[PDB]
């Protein structure tokens, strides 16, 4: 039988754990109670090997006798979070299949599907196996079903020691009780389960096998409810009848931070109970069992997970397939992606409605206005799409990266790969709809050049917003920052309203690093090349070459160069996003 | 009961003097499912509603008080103080303590308490009487150690959570109500603080008052302090009476509660309908119905004063929020600096005419984004407080408009100064005092009109996202209608009319007529279409648009409910 | 608002005594009534409080005399009474009769030696 | 809440401006009171709320607050000021008093 033992564990960073020592066996369930500042989630994370890199973690963690190092935690300990971040536009079967493909790599999909079916039958999810996740308030699966799906995704890796960070928080009483009985049933199948609860109910007292209490990192008690009641009676605080011993022992071993006399009294009581527990035979028996199973010389070795992760290209392809299947199953996201540029162009067409290409009253003015609005709106639509569709995938990646499945930069690369063709077809539709209706130098080569010169800034702004969302949490801050940056770029970069050959040196240098300058140069060279204007002295440019030389003199001979720069602006942003996600991996 | 605080003050400093209030609900049948609810509470008793204290979107207390946005199929009676319930009687006698707090974070406890007192108490009360009432309210809820501490919520230091709940209770208790009704008072509080708050509410109920409390899942120690308890499951009452005898009741009908188990939890878990299955749904519904059957068979000041109080509270609240003011000043300074350095006129090469036109157009049309953003954020950051103070009857939605306007006016003027004064010298525009003052006044009026438009759009739409979308659409329709983008002449019928009511186009035309009129000439205005309206006419048109937006905002505040 | 105290004298340790505080000038049944003593060489020490009719004439005492001192009030003649038992061990003081404790100790008495 | 009054003893003659300080162990939000016990024994409240004055007392006595230290200032002392002075707090239960200062002429 398996046996986990935490001996003299301590976490400094201020001293969140003070000599924590627990002992769990296979087939037993251990619950951990404490206040908000108790540091039980910190202990769970330290045992799972997630925050042991930022702070010094003392104490040993023996598993089946063999002392595991600070690097073998995530390969033997599973950790189920509380956020339960799942993709809404996916079913349970395909989600678990993707999880198994990202975790396991054995061969034909038959074994993967069989493992998924077995785990669903164990988690009682076979009857909702072909139902979309969605939201429970709009017609999706219940919160208990989402928790079961998360537990199944965690169990797919064939674990033996699992930790749960408040699996009953946010759920109703009946659903929380169902989850407790489910965890008890999973633990009874020759496994180890350690869960934390904010405040359990009265009927969950006799369901657990071990109950521990932590306050400010100090272990007040750890044992079965029978010895719990016995010890709390022997200390002089018997639990009254009809008092929910859970709440009574949560109030008895907590400090009151409202006054300074009550705080000292509560601290004195907590220290008294802790000192009485340190002298009791329960902690002595725990330490004896730990040191005995350490020196058994016959129990089996550490049962790890199934195996490690496969190559990077397979995981990248699986993530790409997952994100495109989640996108194509959400009709709203698809229609926004395909019609944002179209709505922008239709709103722009409602005001102009034509370009008078043979009179100098509103020809150059309306043309410059249209080009400015396009250059300032394509990256805005890209940023809108990014802010609207990325955060869910970013949260899913942040949740699934700590488990050892994949990295976040691979998720970002898959997002870019699945967003390339959609932006391509969207900007192509918007071009084929608006360019011909506006009558802007009717031609096919000019139309293709305009389509490319409006497709490039869309992807550029979308990837910049992707980087900012990978480095900044709040999506509204990123939205406002990208909008302001696009404003500044279309104002300073373009020579429409500033005549760059006359702007100061710092702005002239900044305009060289902005894609808006090259975009506007390409658009001017493509639009004002082969058309003439008519005056009917103050403003009469009778041709287009004169206006081109006035705005950007040497932009005609830099067509291919500006196109290459505008298109190479994208891989630089992709590499910057990869680096930004690699940095983000170390700050959360 | 010996683990919590025991050295407290059991004195009652602010008691209710008057006739005892009564509340009787007879055969209430609330649907869209409360069925056959009937109880009768008097002054001096504390009623705690345990179990499913909600019926979807509106709780039971909102149903009793007459509030509720969902369906209200009524088949029973509600008698308050011996008279049928009505919004007037509820506003006059019943006070409500919501679950989510709504307090200005930059105000101390005493300041906001005096504000609510002078906005609630009649005009015949002298200042000394108001301060005495505030002091009695402070001493009653043991808030004397925090009478000068900021009541700031999260993101600010402020005070604790239980103290914030006590401050809200005092705000709702300043006018000395006869019936108090609190929904989820111990939501998000520690156990000791929840116990102290329950003891304080019990003392308030003992002080010749009628206190009703909503609690979905009460703790084991909170349940022991209940005077009267009302168990409700699936909208049906199962038990109604003393809490200490509750178990003694169920043991009398073949349902004993086992030891070492919370009675409230054990009795809300036993009679709860199970939704995981279909064969157990009715299997528990029949038990609930039988238990319900056995239970049923067993038994001033004015308007100008309100405006002054509101504007003073607003000024005291926003003038102490240093981070937001510094952020706004930073945005203004950054905008002004980039605009003035991009169009730097001091140098060997002066600014061209098209460059000056683009500079004026950008000066006019770069502020609305940040302006609307900040205004809508500030409006949606305090929508619940305004809605609740309008529902409870603090003001009559008239003085609030002018109060908000004259409260945002000074900061808006400072923003306009910071954005426009260090931009006129950097760009080296037309020198002099009259053109600079005219430019400043026009920019100020245009930004004021934009602020009023943002206020109206925020108050007209229920959510922040749709309001921001509509405001951005309006701003873009006014931007494309400007006299710089589409020539102001290639518009057939609709965009021309939009430009006629577009403040950005009028701002651009006014700036052009200020800069290029009789300078080096009106011929540049003649080649364009910016010479058909004099300067004073443009100013009057901007003022009229601002007035129309103010009227729209007032109509939206008066007729549209500001539901959070 | 006049307060006068009486009932002080020589008492053997372990006996019993009763001080009387006569009140005039205001509604005796509307305001609090406190007994606050002072040791012969120490600072003022609050002893007991009796609340008004709005609190149903409930009483409260300090942790040093809780159980031995009993304060009461006669509303017919507006006279506060303080019965002391098992005194003269350390309870020797100059006990004063004050009006309001929560609203500041105003309108003190004259004090009587025990 | 402990009230530390300073100084425990003070000697000042006619004409001087006396200042008696009182520090609270916790925050009382200005809920402090200054009483004057005459040598005969008739105690009377001189200052309430730490800033206001009672009716019938001379205006020479004033109340002030610096940080967490309250101050009673007596300008143009008379012969009727030789007496004991006590500071008390009534912001938290129970109500505690101060050490007291024997103002002697
Ligand atoms: C549906 C009707 C109302 C049309 C709505 C179109 C809206 C959603 C789109 C189309 C054109 C878009 C604008 C195009 C240009 C810019 C300039 C950019 O720097 C900030 C965003 C901004 C201001 C966009 C705001 C949103 C916008 C107005
Ligand atoms: C309920 C909570 C989350 C509401 C928070 C409102 C947030 C999302 C909104 C309201 C005000 C907005 C800010 C207004 C001003 C600016 C300054 C600008 O240079 C960067 C964006 C930034 C910083 C905005 C970011 C988003 C913002 C902070």
């Amino acid at each position: 039988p398996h046996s986990l033992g935490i001996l003299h564990a301590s976490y400094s960073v201020r001293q969140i754990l003070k000599d924590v020592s627990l002992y769990v066996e296979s087939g037993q369930i251990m619950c951990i109670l404490g206040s908000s500042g108790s540091g039980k989630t910190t202990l769970l994370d330290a045992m799972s090997g997630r925050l042991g890199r930022a702070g010094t973690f003392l104490g040993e963690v023996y598993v089946n006798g063999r002392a595991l190092r600070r690097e073998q935690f995530q390969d033997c300990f599973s950790y189920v979070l509380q956020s339960d971040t799942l993709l809404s536009s996916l079913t349970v079967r395909e989600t678990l299949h993707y999880t198994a493909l990202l975790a396991i790599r054995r061969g034909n999909p038959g074994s993967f599907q069989k493992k998924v079916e077995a785990v669903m039958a164990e988690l009682s999810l076979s009857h909702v196996a072909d139902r979309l996740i969605g939201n429970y308030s709009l017609g999706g699966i219940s919160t208990g079903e989402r928790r079961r799906v998360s537990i199944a995704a965690q169990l797919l890796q064939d674990p033996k020691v699992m930790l749960f960070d408040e699996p009953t928080t946010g759920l109703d009483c009946m659903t929380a009780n169902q989850i407790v009985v489910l965890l008890v049933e999973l633990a009874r199948r020759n496994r180890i389960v350690v869960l934390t609860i904010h405040q359990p109910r009265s009927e969950l007292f006799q369901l657990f096998d071990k109950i521990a209490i932590l306050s400010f990192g100090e272990l007040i008690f750890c044992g079965t409810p029978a010895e719990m009641l016995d010890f709390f009676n022997d200390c002089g605080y018997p639990c009254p009848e009809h008092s929910n011993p859970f709440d009574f022992y949560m109030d008895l071993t907590s400090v009151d931070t409202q006054s300074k006399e009550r705080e000292i009294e509560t601290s004195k009581r907590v220290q008294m109970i802790e000192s009485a527990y340190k002298k009791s035979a329960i902690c002595h028996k725990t330490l004896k069992n730990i040191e005995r199973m350490k020196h058994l010389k016959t129990l089996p070795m550490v049962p790890f997970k199934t195996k490690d992760s496969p190559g990077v290209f397979s995981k990248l392809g699986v993530l790409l397939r997952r994100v495109t299947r989640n996108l194509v199953r959400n009709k709203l996201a698809v229609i926004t992606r395909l019609l944002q540029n179209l709505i922008m162009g239709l709103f722009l067409l409602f005001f102009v409605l034509r370009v008078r290409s043979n009179v100098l009253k509103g020809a150059i003015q309306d043309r410059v206005g249209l080009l400015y609005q396009f250059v300032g709106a394509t990256p805005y639509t890209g940023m809108l799409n990014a802010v609207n569709l990325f955060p869910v995938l970013r949260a899913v990646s942040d949740q699934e990266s700590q488990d050892g499945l994949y990295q976040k930069w691979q998720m970002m690369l898959a997002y870019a790969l699945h967003v390339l063709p959609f932006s391509v077809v969207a900007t192509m539709i918007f071009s084929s709809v608006c360019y011909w209706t506006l009558g802007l130098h009717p031609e096919v080569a000019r139309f293709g050049y305009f389509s490319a010169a409006l497709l490039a800034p869309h992807l550029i702004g979308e990837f910049l917003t992707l980087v900012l969302l990978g480095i900044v949490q709040n999506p509204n801050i990123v939205n406002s920052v990208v909008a302001l940056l696009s404003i500044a770029g279309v104002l300073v970069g373009s020579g429409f309203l500033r005549n760059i050959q006359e702007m100061p040196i710092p702005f002239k240098i900044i305009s060289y690093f902005t894609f808006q300058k090259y975009c506007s140069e390409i658009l001017v060279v493509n639009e004002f090349y082969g058309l003439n204007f008519t005056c009917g002295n103050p403003m009469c440019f009778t041709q287009g070459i004169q206006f081109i030389e006035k705005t950007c003199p040497g932009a005609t001979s830099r067509f291919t160069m500006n196109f290459l720069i505008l298109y190479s602006f994208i891989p630089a942003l992709v590499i910057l996003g990869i680096v930004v996600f690699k940095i983000r991996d170390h700050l959360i | 009961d010996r683990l919590f605080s025991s050295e407290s003050d059991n004195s009652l400093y602010f008691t209710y003097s008057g006739q005892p209030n009564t509340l009787e609900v007879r055969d209430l049948n609330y649907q869209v499912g409360i069925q056959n609810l009937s109880f009768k509470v008097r002054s001096g008793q504390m009623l705690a509603i345990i179990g499913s204290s909600g019926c979807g979107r509106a709780s039971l207390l909102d149903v009793i008080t007459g509030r509720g946005h969902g369906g209200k199929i009524k088949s029973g009676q509600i008698w308050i103080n011996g008279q049928p319930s009505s919004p007037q009687l509820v506003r006059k006698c019943v006070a409500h303590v919501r679950q989510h707090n709504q307090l200005l974070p930059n105000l101390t406890v005493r300041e906001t308490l005096a504000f609510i007192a002078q906005m609630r108490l009649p005009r015949t009360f002298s200042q000394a009487q108001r301060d005495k009432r505030v002091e009695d309210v402070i001493a009653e809820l043991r808030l004397r150690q925090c009478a000068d501490t900021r009541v700031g919520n999260m993101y600010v230091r402020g005070l604790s959570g239980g103290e914030r709940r006590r401050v809200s209770i005092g705000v709702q208790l300043l006018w000395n109500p006869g019936i108090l009704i609190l929904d989820e008072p111990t939501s998000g509080l520690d156990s000791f603080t929840a116990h102290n708050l329950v003891k304080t509410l019990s003392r308030l109920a003992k002080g010749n008052r009628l206190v009703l409390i909503s609690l979905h899942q009460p703790r084991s120690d909170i349940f022991r302090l209940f005077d009267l308890v009302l168990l409700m499951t699936s909208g049906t009452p199962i038990y109604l009476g003393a809490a200490q005898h509750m178990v003694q009741y169920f043991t009398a009908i073949g349902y004993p509660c086992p030891r070492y188990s919370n009675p409230a939890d054990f009795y809300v878990d036993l009679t709860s309908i199970d939704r995981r299955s279909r064969e157990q749904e009715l299997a528990t519904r029949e038990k609930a119905q039988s238990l319900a059957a056995l239970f049923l068979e067993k038994v001033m000041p004015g308007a100008v004063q309100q405006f002054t109080t509101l504007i003073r509270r607003q000024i005291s609240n926003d003038f102490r929020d240093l981070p937001t003011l510094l952020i706004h000043g930073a945005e203004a300074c950054l905008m002004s600096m980039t605009i003035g350095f991009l169009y730097f006129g001091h140098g060997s090469i002066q600014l061209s005419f098209m460059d000056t036109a683009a500079l004026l157009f950008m000066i006019g049309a770069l502020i609305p984004f940040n302006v609307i953003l900040d205004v809508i954020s500030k409006c949606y950051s305090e929508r619940a407080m305004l809605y609740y103070e309008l529902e409870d009857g603090l003001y009559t939605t008239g003085p609030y408009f002018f109060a908000k306007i004259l409260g945002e006016l000074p900061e808006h003027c400072a923003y306009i100064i910071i954005y426009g004064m260090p931009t006129y010298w950097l760009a080296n525009l037309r020198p002099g005092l009259q053109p600079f003052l005219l430019h400043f006044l026009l920019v100020w009026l245009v930004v004021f009109c934009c602020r009023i438009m943002a206020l109206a759009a925020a108050a007209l739409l229920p959510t922040f996202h749709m309001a921001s979308f509509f405001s951005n659409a309006l701003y873009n329709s006014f931007y494309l209608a400007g006299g710089f983008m589409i020539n102001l002449s290639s518009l057939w019928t609709v965009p021309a009319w939009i430009s006629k009511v577009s403040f950005l186009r009028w701002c651009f035309e006014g700036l052009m007529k200020i800069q290029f009129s009789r300078r080096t000439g009106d011929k540049i205005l003649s080649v364009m279409e910016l010479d058909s309206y004099p300067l004073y006419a443009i100013y009057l048109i901007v003022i009229g648009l601002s007035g129309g937006f103010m009227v729209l905002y007032y109509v939206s505040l008066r007729f549209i409910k500001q539901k959070p | 608002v006049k307060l006068v105290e009486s009932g002080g004298g020589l008492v053997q340790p372990g006996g019993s005594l009763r001080l009387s505080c006569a009140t005039s000038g205001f509604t005796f049944s509307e305001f609090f009534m406190e007994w606050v003593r002072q040791p012969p060489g120490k600072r003022l020490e609050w002893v007991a409080v009796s609340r008004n009719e709005a609190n149903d004439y409930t009483t409260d005492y300090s942790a040093s005399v809780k159980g031995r001192f009993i304060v009461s009030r006669d509303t017919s003649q507006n006279i506060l009474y303080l019965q002391m038992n098992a005194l003269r061990a350390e309870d020797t003081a100059i006990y004063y009769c004050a009006r309001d404790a929560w609203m500041g100790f105003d309108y003190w008495g004259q004090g009587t030696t025990v | 809440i402990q009230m530390t009054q300073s100084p425990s003893s003070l000697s000042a003659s006619l004409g001087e401006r006396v200042s008696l300080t009182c520090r609270a162990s916790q925050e009382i939000s200005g809920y402090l009171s200054w009483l004057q016990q005459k040598p005969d024994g008739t105690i009377q409240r001189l200052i309430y709320a730490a800033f206001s004055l009672d009716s019938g007392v001379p205006k020479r006595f004033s109340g002030s607050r610096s940080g967490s230290d309250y101050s009673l200032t007596i300008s143009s002392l008379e012969s009727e000021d030789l007496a004991h002075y006590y500071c008390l707090q009534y912001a938290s239960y129970p109500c505690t008093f101060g050490g007291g200062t024997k103002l002697e002429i």
Side-chain angles (χ1 to χ4, degrees), chain B residues 30-32 69-73:
Chain B
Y30 183 79
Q31 323 264 29
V32 183
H69 28 284
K72 181 160 271 162
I73 297 314

Side-chain angles (χ1 to χ4, degrees), chain B residues 100-162:
Chain B
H100 300 289
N101 284 307
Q102 55 263 357
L103 298 174
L104 293 182
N106 293 272
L107 300 176
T108 68
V109 177
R110 192 194 306 271
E111 284 180 343
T112 183
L113 279 184
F115 286 150
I116 299 298
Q118 72 176 162
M119 258 188 296
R120 271 284 199 171
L121 294 178
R123 70 167 74 98
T124 80
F125 271 5
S126 51
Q127 189 67 27
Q129 293 184 265
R130 284 189 262 264
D131 319 311
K132 189 189 186 313
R133 177 65 64 91
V134 168
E135 291 315 279
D136 283 8
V137 167
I138 286 177
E140 169 65 30
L141 304 170
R142 309 300 179 274
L143 292 179
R144 286 190 161 178
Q145 293 196 87
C146 329
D148 291 329
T149 301
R150 299 288 180 85
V151 77
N153 57 353
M154 80 83 177
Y155 282 158
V156 203
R157 277 289 293 105
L159 42 90
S160 324

Side-chain angles (χ1 to χ4, degrees), chain C residues 25-36:
Chain C
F26 68 97
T27 326
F28 183 78
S29 99
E30 193 145 350
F31 295 84
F32 295 79
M33 291 297 296
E34 292 93 14
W35 285 103
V36 174

Side-chain angles (χ1 to χ4, degrees), chain B residues 362-531:
Chain B
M362 278 301 144
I363 285 173
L366 273 199
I367 41 97
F369 171 77
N370 284 137
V371 162
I372 297 158
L373 196 90
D374 310 338
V375 166
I376 295 192
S377 306
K378 189 175 181 180
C379 271
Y380 276 95
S381 99
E382 57 187 15
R383 214 164 185 260
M385 185 175 187
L386 164 67
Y387 173 75
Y388 286 149
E389 291 202 12
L390 269 175
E391 196 173 27
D392 284 292
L394 273 87
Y395 31 89
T396 169
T397 212
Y400 178 80
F401 163 78
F402 301 96
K404 186 74 165 62
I405 295 320
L406 303 185
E408 57 156 60
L409 206 74
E411 174 261 18
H412 147 81
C413 163
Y415 181 91
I416 289 329
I417 280 185
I418 298 184
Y419 174 79
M421 291 187 348
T423 298
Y424 198 92
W425 316 115
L426 286 180
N428 196 20
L429 291 188
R430 162 176 255 186
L433 185 57
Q434 171 182 163
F436 164 75
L437 284 178
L438 289 176
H439 172 102
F440 176 79
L441 180 61
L442 188 58
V443 169
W444 191 88
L445 288 180
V446 166
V447 181
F448 179 76
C449 192
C450 169
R451 285 185 177 272
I452 303 298
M453 175 182 70
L455 293 152
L460 191 57
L461 297 197
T463 167
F464 166 82
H465 288 278
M466 192 165 357
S468 147
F469 163 73
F470 178 70
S471 316
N472 291 329
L474 269 190
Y475 155 69
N476 276 87
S477 36
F478 295 150
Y479 178 88
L480 290 187
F484 188 80
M485 306 300 290
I486 327 290
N487 190 257
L488 205 57
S489 152
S490 74
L491 319 176
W492 32 282
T493 84
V494 171
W497 272 111
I498 295 182
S499 99
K500 291 304 182 56
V501 298
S502 147
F503 52 90
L504 299 173
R505 166 253 167 99
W506 291 118
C507 163
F508 176 68
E509 184 175 354
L511 297 195
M512 212 78 164
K513 290 190 59 54
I514 286 164
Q515 292 288 148
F516 288 156
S517 84
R518 297 156 54 192
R519 187 179 182 180
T520 166
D522 320 288
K523 59 267 182 180
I524 311 102
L525 304 181
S526 315
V527 307
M528 301 185 63
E529 301 315 339
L530 308 179
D531 52 7

Side-chain angles (χ1 to χ4, degrees), chain B residues 40-197:
Chain B
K40 182 185 181 304
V41 278
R42 208 190 172 99
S43 92
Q45 300 170 153
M46 187 181 63
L47 184 63
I49 310 171
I50 71 167
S52 324
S53 36
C55 196
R57 295 295 188 270
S59 325
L60 172 57
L61 302 175
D62 303 72
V63 171
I64 299 308
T65 51
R67 285 94 158 91
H69 28 284
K72 181 160 271 162
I73 297 314
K74 285 286 187 177
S75 321
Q77 295 170 330
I78 297 180
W79 303 81
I80 302 178
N81 277 266
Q83 310 178 8
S85 98
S86 66
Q88 282 72 239
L89 193 67
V90 171
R91 185 183 287 102
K92 186 214 304 176
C93 322
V94 182
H96 202 175
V97 180
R98 279 83 181 181
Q99 183 176 180
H100 300 289
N101 284 307
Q102 55 263 357
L103 298 174
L104 293 182
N106 293 272
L107 300 176
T108 68
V109 177
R110 192 194 306 271
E111 284 180 343
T112 183
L113 279 184
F115 286 150
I116 299 298
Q118 72 176 162
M119 258 188 296
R120 271 284 199 171
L121 294 178
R123 70 167 74 98
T124 80
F125 271 5
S126 51
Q127 189 67 27
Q129 293 184 265
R130 284 189 262 264
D131 319 311
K132 189 189 186 313
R133 177 65 64 91
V134 168
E135 291 315 279
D136 283 8
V137 167
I138 286 177
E140 169 65 30
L141 304 170
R142 309 300 179 274
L143 292 179
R144 286 190 161 178
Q145 293 196 87
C146 329
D148 291 329
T149 301
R150 299 288 180 85
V151 77
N153 57 353
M154 80 83 177
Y155 282 158
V156 203
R157 277 289 293 105
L159 42 90
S160 324
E163 301 176 344
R164 245 184 306 273
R165 209 61 52 90
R166 293 175 186 267
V167 165
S168 285
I169 291 175
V171 166
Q172 288 293 330
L173 208 70
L174 268 156
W175 56 285
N176 195 26
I179 297 180
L180 186 62
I181 282 178
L182 313 92
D183 43 32
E184 286 290 336
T186 77
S187 99
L189 298 177
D190 35 322
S191 324
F192 304 93
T193 301
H195 195 270
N196 291 333
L197 188 58

Side-chain angles (χ1 to χ4, degrees), chain A residues 102-208:
Chain A
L102 286 171
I104 328 179
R105 179 245 303 182
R106 218 276 309 169
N108 58 274
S111 148
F112 295 95
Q113 184 73 20
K114 179 172 320 302
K115 181 62 175 181
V116 167
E117 201 66 60
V119 174
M120 284 193 298
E122 183 178 1
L123 268 306
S124 161
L125 289 173
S126 36
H127 65 124
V128 184
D130 290 328
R131 281 195 58 186
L132 299 165
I133 299 302
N135 313 47
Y136 53 90
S137 36
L138 319 173
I141 69 170
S142 34
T143 37
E145 282 161 326
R146 303 172 120 274
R147 296 233 54 88
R148 290 178 206 271
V149 164
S150 303
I151 292 176
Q154 284 291 145
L155 258 163
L156 270 163
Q157 308 186 33
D158 184 351
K160 289 303 179 180
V161 187
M162 308 175 61
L163 317 178
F164 290 84
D165 175 69
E166 282 174 296
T168 60
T169 299
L171 320 180
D172 42 279
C173 328
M174 256 312 313
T175 305
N177 177 265
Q178 291 167 22
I179 293 300
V180 180
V181 192
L182 177 66
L183 296 190
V184 163
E185 261 323 307
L186 288 171
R188 256 66 171 96
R189 209 183 313 273
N190 194 21
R191 229 186 310 271
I192 301 179
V193 171
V194 178
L195 84 160
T196 43
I197 315 185
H198 178 210
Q199 34 178 340
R201 312 188 89 262
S202 36
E203 63 274 1
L204 311 181
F205 192 67
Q206 297 293 334
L207 290 178
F208 300 141

